[PDB]
Every structure is written in structure tokens, then in C-alpha cells.
């Protein structure tokens, strides 16, 4: 099982990244014997996952012999996001590109009702888009919360009332397809490594700034997930010893000063105290509004964003110290004020981590944010490279 | 190569932990076909790494047929520590137990001279202990500093003047034996998982308190090392925003308050300022002296240890937040005052990490500290289980 799987993935990754490629070149690059290369490629050819123009075809039809390449056309997968009060279902081509996507509002809260609705929506999707669906190989689903990826179990999550929902097994039962379930921040860090702005390093950290604060840590080309998909959670690191009480019951947690709500609340408090701002007449201040005010030079909004940067910089300095990453990516709507935020983050990184660690350290914006299903695409790409999905497709 | 290797290690680990065991039981447990089990066990038997009493032997010699067991007797390895101003060479039996150990004082500083001395000492060891040496399979070496384990390269280290010393390749050239090189803190965390006080969990953190402060992080049964063997370094995390200048040039680093030197310096300063203590007449105060004073009820020493615990607790709370470990181990001479230190650490853990994360969280003393070569023993045991060393032994 795991025997063939690993080598099949290694060979397929070489073909995907380096094709058209000869069997002899695959043998040299993979360090596998020609006999092994032959057996692996034959299974992949017969499954129509890869293709070549053979010598016999070349002579027969009067065109050049061409080395092995991935045969993505016709192959597809579903990538889903279970978000706060909604479900996104997207159809992707195997290479990762979105073909169709729909966002469905979800007013269910309790586990059984959420699951019933989600399966109904998958069924409806297959019926509605039947003509555009071809060879669907798998389903990926990403979501906030505690997720056991190995088992496909959501232990608990924001918004919904969930306790150990067997999301992967349930979707697999309803579809017969392999299902890949992951925490969204962790899967997003993988998408940045496979498709995004951390392709150039094997050691990086993605900092997700939204409702909560989380780091998706890539070490040696793979994301750290853990049994609960929570490796890298930043929100309950104490950053102010004498700070506000957190929902967790402790004081001075990062999320008391750096969550979307905490930033909006700060702006609201300073305006109420009589600090001047272009936001002082605005109803229902959003993070977008704050970022647009700061970007446009509003002293109060600038100051609020800089303070946020200092706190983020402190948390990021911690991660740098522990992981020695080669790159830092920032993701979230807060990137709309990056000209203001980044210098604040960077100065605190310089002051709170080793010079040698942060010397050539790029601080950059993530490629993805509103592409909610690209994280699921990354899970599928990595399952092809791990050989897991290849064997499922070969097996039938 | 990697094909056979992985399965050979999986089978060998089953035999080591569960033998005497039948081939059918190995087939069921490993999920490998009998044909594969046969091929793997045959190579391991012929290499004399495992043994059984076959049916033919049982009938022939009138004793019971006995399932496969590891055949450790006769097999050995060397485990070395390059410490500050010394080299320890120990001969171990393959199961991990020490047979001979010697500590050699080393007054060399520069890379070339250090390496020349170390190879001379290995040569001398083989000659001196020739009668006690049997089948030496490998050499493990652990040391403080930045270590690339994959390559066997020491990038830099304390005490010695080192820059990218190819320690593994050089020892391999001088001996023909496989060489396993690792950072000492990381290899120690592995020894605790394989031989020590974290055998019962797959997710743990070892906190090493000595010259520096480091966490050896075990995730899913394996230690996080990184390309530089420095994943988990704690010493330059800023724990006091308005603190002492560190050797790194930044202010308020953990090692400014928690290194062995910083503790001794605190005691020295408070006595000079006129604070009463049983240590106030003692020349050359050691950490052992401070711990013995605290354990014996000296108010000043107690207060110094409690303050240390608060700072360690803050750093450990950070690691808990990021990793959600199932167990925390503390290693170092400071364990001589654990009755005083641990409650201080624990209260700060409660106040600076999620209740759910630290509820059933045991804080315990490490099994090893003065067993300087047990970390190297762990590297060898894990290389057997990974199958790497098995294949080297089979290959001849
Ligand atoms: Zn909190
Ligand atoms: Zn420092």
C-alpha cells in the first residue's frame, strides 16, 4: 500500500514539475531503477493520469516522440469551505484552477442539521452542474476550528455547535470519493507554498489575521497541523501582562488587542473619548473603513494600525525565535493598510528576535485571501504528490 | 532503497516491542502481505538482527518453537558527546545500555584541531577497548549548537571555534561506520520519548535549562529538529520589555534572567545589596548551592528560584499555546529545587495558556541529565526503527 504510494507520488511530482520528461531522466532524478519506473508509469498511463507520445505513435502518425506529462484535462475535484453562516462549493480542474464556484447561505447551527444540509448541497451541486462535471477525483473541505485531518473529524468550531463531527467519513459515505478535511489556516499556508507567495522556500510562516490570530507553519516543505489542526495558534499568547480579560478567563491575550473586534472596539473607544478622526461621523466602522482611513492618512487610524503592528510583531518575533523561518507572509483584510502595518511589525521583529534570524527575512502579502477554496486545492495537489490520491484513482 | 528501508524498520520495531511474535501476527499488525513479511524477516535473520526457533530446530533439538525476537547480544554502537572542553565516548549495547564510558578533557578550540583530536580519540578507543568491542554498527554524536542532522554538519557551536564542520562525513571517512550527528537538546527529547519520561505520549516538550534555554519538541512521535537543529530555542524570546541588554544586542531576552550565569549573578547582586542569606558567606556560589539553599528553606534562594520559575512558566506557556503538548518535562540541575520551582512554573502556565490546554498537563522531571550519551543512543534506536541502520547492517 504505502510502498507503491510513495514512489508513485515522487514520480508523478517529477512529471508534473519537469515534464515532458524521459523515463531515463525520471530514473536518474528519482533514484529508482528502470524496472520500478516502468511499473509506476504503466499504472499511471493506464489510469490516464499521465501521457506520452511513444515511438510507435510518433512514427505511425508522423509527429515527434514526446516524454511523459501530466494529463490534467478531464480530471477535476471539488473544494469546499464551511465558513461562518455559509458553504462554498467550487469545481476545480486537477491542476488547481477554479471552473465553477457557488456560495450558499447556511442558517443551520447544530451538528446534525449542518451535516444534513451540506450533503443535500453536494447532491444538488452534482445535479445542477452535471454537464460541466467530468472526472471528479476527490473532495477537499476547509474550515476554521479544531480538525483531525488524518481522521476527517471536526472536534469543534466557531459559529456552529459541533462536537466530533465525522465530516470526512460522512461525505465519503455520501459520494464514494476520497475526502480531505483540514483547518483553513493550515491549508492556506500549504496553498501559499504550492500555489502562492511562499513557493520559493521550504520554511515559512503564514500569519492569518481575522477573527482570530493563527500561524500556519511550513517546515521542510510541509505544514505543521497536529492532531487538532491547531499548531501555531497565536490568540492566547499573553502579550500584555496587565491587560484586558479574555473570553478564556486569562488576561492580556493577543486576541484582546488584535482580533477584528478588538481593533474596531479600540477605534470606537478613542472616538468616544474625543480623539479627532475622519471616522468620527461614520456609522458601523469596519476593518476596511479603518484601513482605508489609515491608507488615506487619518492620524487616528494610522495610530491604531501601528499599535496592531507592534502586537503582531511581538507574536511574530516569538515564532521567528522558535522556528527560524526563511519567509513571513501576512494574510487578511489588514493588508489594505500594509504600507502602515508592515514597518510597525518589522521594527518589533528587529527588537525581539536575533539579528541572524531576521536579516534576510522578507515580510510579504499572501497571494490568496478571498480565494476561499484554494486551500482545499492545495490538499488535493499534496495528496497527488504523496501518491495517496493517485492510488485511489488507479484503484478505480 | 527507501522502499525496503521503511518496511524493514516497521517490522523490526514490531519484533523489538512485541516479540516473540509470529510471522502471521507481524503480517496482521504491519498490514503487509506474507510474501513481504517473508522477504523482510529473511534479510533480518541472515543479518543476525533477529532470531527465532523454527519448527525444524524445535523438533530437532526438543525445545519449543519460538517467534521472532530481536537479537541484540553481540551488537553495539558508540555514542559520543562533544561537550564544553571535553569529549565523552561510550560503548553501548544495541538495546541502549552503557557498557563502557570515558570522559576526555579537550583543550583544542579551533575546528581543524578539534576534529584531529576527536578522530585520534576514536582510534585510541578502538585499540584500548578491543577485547570488549564486538559488532559495532554505528556512531552517534550529540553536541550543543547549530547542527544539520541530514548532512552531519555542525554549522557553529558554543566553546569551540567552528564553521560548517563536516563532523559526520569525517567520522564516516575515518571509520567506515554510519554516523548520526544531532543537537544535544533535540536528541535528549528523543531519548525521553524512547527511553525516558515521555514514553507514554506522542506530543511532548522537554525544557532544557542550562547555559541556554531550549525546548525539544516532540510532535507525532518525532522530534522537531529543523535544518539547523534549533527548533524550540527559547533564549531570545523577549520576556521583559524593559529588561537587561542581551549579548545579542536586544533587551529583555529570556537568557538575561534564566541562564545559569544570570541566576548566579542575581544571587550575587542581592547579597551585595545586603539581603540576608545563608549564602552570604559562601565563595563561588554554584547553581547546586542555590538549589540546596532553596530546598533547605533559605528565603533568598527560594525567592530566586520562584522568580526563575515565573520566567520559565511564561516561556513554557508560549510553547503550550503553539503546540498543545500532552506533557512537559523539565531537565537540568535546577531539578534539585523542583519542589520550589515547579509550583511557580505551573501558576504562570495557568495564567498564560488556555485552561483546556493545561488541564491534564503533567509537569515532570526528565529521566536523563548526567547520562550524556543516552541522546546518541536514541538516534541509533530511531535509525533502527526508520530502517536506515538495519539496511546498513544488512548491506554489510
Ligand atoms: Zn485568552
Ligand atoms: Zn537575546
What is the CA(A346)–ligand 2 centre distance, in A?
17
Chain A residues with CB-CB distance to B353 below 8 A? 236, 250
* Residue partners of B290: CB distance under 8 A and separation at least 6: B263, B264, B267, B279, B301, B304, B305, B337
Which of 3.40.50.300, 1.10.40.30, 3.40.190.80, 3.30.420.40 would CATH assign to domain A199-368? 3.30.420.40
DSSP B6-47: HHHHHHHHHHHHH-SB-HHHHHHHHT--HHHHHHHHHHHHHT
**Nearest-angstrom CA–CA distance, A142 and A184:** 5
CA neighbor of A188 nearest in space, from A375, A8, A355, A58: A375
Per-position b or e across B153-167, b if 16+ CB within 10 A of its CB: bbbebebbebeebbb
Decide if B233 and A353 are in contact by the 8 Å CB cutoff: no
According to the annotation, is B291 in a ligand binding site? Answer: no
Residues 6+ apart with CB under 8 A from A40: A4, A7, A8, A11, A32
Q: Which are the contacts of B109, defined by CB distance < 8 A and separation ≥ 6?
A: B159, B160, B161
| CB proximity list for A373: less than 8 A, separation 6 or greater | A79, A80, A81, A88, A90, A92, A98, A101, A140, A142
Q: In chain A, what residues touch B324 (CB-CB under 8 Å)?
A: 226, 228, 230-231, 233
- Give contacts of A 154-193 with B, CB under 8 A: none
The whole-angstrom separation of Cα B269 and Cα B266 is 5
Edge to edge, the sheet with strand A98-105 lists A98-105, A86-93, A75-83, A135-143, A179-183
Q: Rounded CA gap, B7 and B367, in Å?
A: 31
- Is any Cβ of chain B less than 8 angstroms from the Cβ of A355? yes
Q: Which of A117, A112, A211, A108 is nearest to A165 (CA)?
A: A112
A329-A331-A333-A339 Cα dihedral, nearest 10 degrees: 0
Specify the residue for cell string 475622519: A278
Method in brief: X-ray
Beta bridge partners of B23: none
CATH class belonging to B1-72: mainly alpha
Render the burial of A235-263: b for 16+ CB within 10 Å, e for the rest: bbbbbeeeeeebebebbbbbbbbbbbebb
∠ CA(B330), CA(B332), CA(B335), 5° rounding?
70
What is the DSSP pairing of strand A362-365 with strand A327-331? parallel
Candidate from A3, A251, A323 with C-beta closest to B3: A3
Sign of CA dihedral B81, B86, B87, B92: negative
Domain boundaries, chain A: 1-72, 73-198+369-396, 199-368
Query: In angstroms, how far is CA A302 from the centroid of its own chain?
Result: 29
| B226: chain A residues, CB-CB within 8 Å | 203, 219-220, 323-324
Chain B touched by A31 (CB under 8 Å): yes
Instruction: Give the rounded distance of the alpha carbon of A155 from its chain centre.
Output: 19
Q: What is the CATH number of domain B73-198+369-396?
A: 3.30.420.40
Is B236 within any annotated ligand binding site?
yes
* B130 CB-contact burial (10 Å; exposed 0-12 / middle 13-18 / buried 19+): exposed
Name, in order, each residue with C-beta under 8 angstroms of A290's C-beta and a sequence gap of 6 or more. A263, A264, A267, A279, A301, A304, A305, A337
Report the chain A residue with the minimal C-alpha distance to residue B317: A237
Chain A contact probe: residue of B321, B350, B386 with most A CBs at under 10 A:
B321
Nearest chain B residue to A356 by CA distance is: B248
Report the distance separating Cα B69 and Cα B49, nearest Å.
Answer: 9
Q: What is the rounded CA–CA span in Å between residue B383 and residue B9?
A: 8
What is the SS3 string spanning chain A? Answer: CHHHHHHHHHHHHHHHHHCCECHHHHHHHHCCCHHHHHHHHHHHHHCCCEEEECHHHHHHHCCCCEEEEECCCCEEEEEEEEECCEEEEEEEECCCCEEEEEEEECCCCEHHHHHHHHHHHHHHHHHHCCCCCCEEEEEEEEECCEEECCCCEEEECCCCECCCECHHHHHHHHHCCCEEEEEHHHHHHHHHHHHCCCCCCCCEEEEEECCCEEEEEEECCEECCCCCCCCCECCCCECCCCCCECCCCCECECHHHHCHHHHHHHHHHHHHCCCCCCCCCCCCCCHHHHHHHHHCCCHHHHHHHHHHHHHHHHHHHHHHHHHCCCEEEEECHHHHHHHHHHHHHHHHHHHHCCHHHHCCCEEEECCCCCCCCHHHHHHHHHHHHCCHHHHHHHHC
3-state per-residue secondary structure call for A266-285 = HHHHHHHCCCCCCCCCCCCC
For residue B66, give the 3-state DSSP assignment. Answer: strand
> Looking at chain B, after which residues does the C atom sit over 2.5 Å from the next written N, breaking the chain?
none
Q: What is the rounded CA–CA span in Å between residue A95 and residue A72?
A: 6
B248 is annotated as contributing to ligand binding: yes
The residue of chain A nearest to residue B320, with distances taken between CA atoms, is: A237
CB B255 within 8 A of CB B236: yes
Other C-beta atoms lying within 10 Å of the C-beta of residue A392: 15
Shortest distance, CA B222 to any CA of chain A (angstroms) = 12
> Is B246 annotated as ligand-binding?
yes
Buried b or exposed e, range B184-196, using 16+ CB within 10 angstroms: bbbbbbbbbbbbb
As a whole number of Å, the end-to-end CA separation of chain A is 15
C-alpha cell at A365: 502579502
Collect all residues of chain A within an 8 Å Cβ-Cβ radius of residue B231. 219, 322-324
Closest by CA position to B217, among listed B180, B237, B236, B190: B190
Q: How far is the CA of A354 from the centre of ligand 2 (A)?
A: 6
Determine the Cα–Cα distance for residues B241 and B289; give it in Å rounded to an integer: 30
Taking alpha carbons only, the member of A371, A357, A394 closest to residue A81 is A371
**For chain B, how are helix, strand and coil distributed in percent, rounded to 5?**
45, 20, 35
Angstrom distances, CA of residue B95 to CA of B44, B330, B379, B396: 16, 25, 12, 20
- Nearest Cα neighbor of A375 from A192, A220, A211 is A192
Task: Tell me which residue in B3, B238, B354 faces A236 most closely, judged by beta carbons.
Answer: B354
Q: Do B355 and A248 touch (CB under 8 A)?
A: yes
| CB-CB under 8 Å, A248 with B354 | yes
Distance of alpha carbon B353 from alpha carbon B338, whole angstroms: 21
Cα torsion at A202, A205, A208, A214 (round to 10°)? 120
- Distance between B257 CA and the closest CA of chain A, angstroms: 15
Q: Say if B249 is an interface residue toward chain A (CB within 8 Å).
A: yes
Q: Which three cell numbers mark B333?
A: 540541575
Distance between CA atoms of residues A94 and A77, nearest Å: 6
- Kindly write down the DSSP assignment for every residue of B105-140, as one continuous string: E----BHHHHHHHHHHHHHHHHHHTTTT--EEEEEE
> Phi/psi zone of residue A61: left (φ > 0), alpha (ψ -120 to 50 degrees), beta?
alpha
Distance CA B208, CA B197 (A): 14
Could you tell me how many residues make up chain A? 396
Resolution in A: 2.0
* Closest C-alpha among B318, B184, B46 to residue A316: B318
What is d(CA A239, CA A246) in angstroms, rounded to the nearest whole number?
12
Instruction: Tell me whether domains A1-72 and A199-368 share a fold.
Output: no
Q: Tell me, yes or no, if A334 comes closer than 8 A to chain B by beta carbon.
A: no
Distance of CA B313 to the CA centre of its chain: 22
* Helix (H), strand (E) at residue B350: helix B338-352
Q: Look at residues A314, A329, A331, A315 and name the one whose alpha carbon lies nearest to residue A361.
A: A329
* CA–CA dist A162, A155 (Å, integer): 7
C-alpha cell at A105: 447561505
Cell of B325: 503538548
SS3 B163: coil
**Ligand nearest A240 Cα, by number?**
1
Q: How far is the CA of A163 from the centre of ligand 2 (A)?
A: 43
**Which contiguous run of DSSP H or E holds residue B383?**
helix B374-385
Please check whether residue A393 is in contact with residue A72, taking contact to mean a CB–CB distance below 8 angstroms: no
A45: how many CB neighbours lie within 10 A of its CB? 15
Assigned C-alpha cell, A344: 510597525
Per-residue buried b or exposed e for A280-313, using 16+ beta carbons within 10 Å of the residue's own CB: eeeeebebebbbbbbbeebebbbbbbbebbbbbb
Strand partners, B91: B78, B100
Amino acid at each position: 500500500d504505502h510502498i507503491k504510494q510513495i514512489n508513485a507520488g515522487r514520480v508523478y511530482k517529477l512529471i508534473d514539475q519537469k515534464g515532458p520528461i524521459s523515463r531515463i531522466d525520471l530514473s536518474k532524478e528519482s533514484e529508482l531503477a528502470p524496472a520500478s519506473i516502468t511499473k509506476i508509469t504503466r499504472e499511471l498511463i493506464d489510469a490516464h493520469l499521465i501521457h506520452e507520445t511513444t515511438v510507435q505513435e510518433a512514427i505511425s502518425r508522423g509527429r515527434p516522440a514526446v516524454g511523459l506529462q501530466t494529463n490534467n484535462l478531464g480530471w477535476q475535484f471539488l473544494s469546499m469551505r464551511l465558513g461562518r453562516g455559509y458553504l462554498t462549493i467550487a469545481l476545480h480542474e486537477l491542476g488547481g484552477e477554479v471552473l465553477i464556484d457557488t456560495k450558499i447561505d447556511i442558517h443551520e447551527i447544530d451538528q446534525d442539521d449542518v451535516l444534513a444540509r451540506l450533503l443535500f448541497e453536494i447532491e444538488e451541486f452534482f445535479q445542477t452542474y452535471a454537464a460541466q462535471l467530468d472526472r471528479v477525483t476527490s473532495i477537499a473541505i476547509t474550515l476554521p476550528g479544531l480538525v483531525n485531518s488524518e481522521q476527517g473529524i471536526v472536534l469543534q468550531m466557531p459559529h456552529y455547535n459541533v462536537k466530533n463531527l465525522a465530516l470526512g467519513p460522512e461525505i465519503y459515505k455520501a459520494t464514494g470519493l476520497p475526502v480531505f478535511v483540514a483547518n483553513d489556516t493550515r491549508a492556506w499556508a500549504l496553498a501559499e507554498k504550492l500555489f502562492g507567495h511562499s513557493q520559493d522556500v521550504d520554511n515559512s510562516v503564514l500569519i492569518s489575521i481575522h477573527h482570530g490570530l493563527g500561524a500556519g507553519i511550513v517546515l521542510d516543505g510541509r505544514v505543521l497541523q497536529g492532531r487538532h489542526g491547531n499548531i501555531g495558534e497565536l490568540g492566547h499568547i499573553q502579550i500584555d501582562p496587565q491587560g484586558k480579560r479574555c473570553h478564556c478567563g486569562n488576561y492580556g491575550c493577543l486576541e484582546t488587542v488584535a482580533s477584528s473586534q478588538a481593533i474596531r472596539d479600540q477605534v470606537t473607544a478613542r472616538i468616544q473619548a474625543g480623539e479627532p478622526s475622519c471616522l468620527a461621523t461614520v456609522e458601523e466602522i469596519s476593518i476596511e473603513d479603518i484601513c482605508a482611513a489609515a491608507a488615506d492618512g487619518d492620524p487616528l487610524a494610522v495610530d491604531v494600525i501601528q499599535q496592531l503592528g507592534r502586537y503582531l510583531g511581538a507574536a511574530i518575533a516569538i515564532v521567528i525565535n522558535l522556528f527560524n523561518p526563511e519567509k513571513i507572509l501576512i494574510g487578511g483584510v489588514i493588508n489594505q493598510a500594509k504600507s502602515i502595518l508592515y514597518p510597525s511589525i518589522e521594527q518589533c521583529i528587529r527588537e525581539q528576535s536575533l539579528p541572524v534570524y531576521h536579516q534576510d527575512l522578507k515580510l510579504v502579502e499572501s497571494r490568496f485571501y478571498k480565494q476561499a477554496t484554494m486551500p482545499g486545492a492545495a490538499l488535493i495537489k499534496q495528496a497527488l504528490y504523496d501518491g495517496l490520491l493517485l492510488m485511489k484513482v488507479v484503484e478505480g
